[PDB]
Each structure stands twice: as structure tokens, then as C-alpha cells.
Amino acid sequence: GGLHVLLTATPVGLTLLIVLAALGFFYGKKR
Numbered sequence: 001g002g003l004h005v006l007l008t009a010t011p012v013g014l015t016l017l018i019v020l021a022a023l024g025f026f027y028g029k030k031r
Contacts, residue, residue, distance in 0.1 A: 007013040
């Protein structure tokens with residue numbers, strides 16, 4: 001209990017958020 005939450009604060013977290021969102025959009029439009 002700590003790092004899991006800190007990840008949201010740290011920059012690394014945000015950097016990953018964009019990636020996850022990117023794949024989602026691409027996958028959604030792709031088929």
C-alpha cells in the first residue's frame with residue numbers, strides 16, 4: 001500500500017496512461 005497510489009502521482013504513471021489510451025483508440029477503430 002503506497003507505490004500503487006504513488007504511481008498516479010509520479011510522471012511515469014501519466015506517461016503510461018497515454019499509451020493505454022492510444023492502443024484503445026487504435027484497437028477500437030481497427031478491426
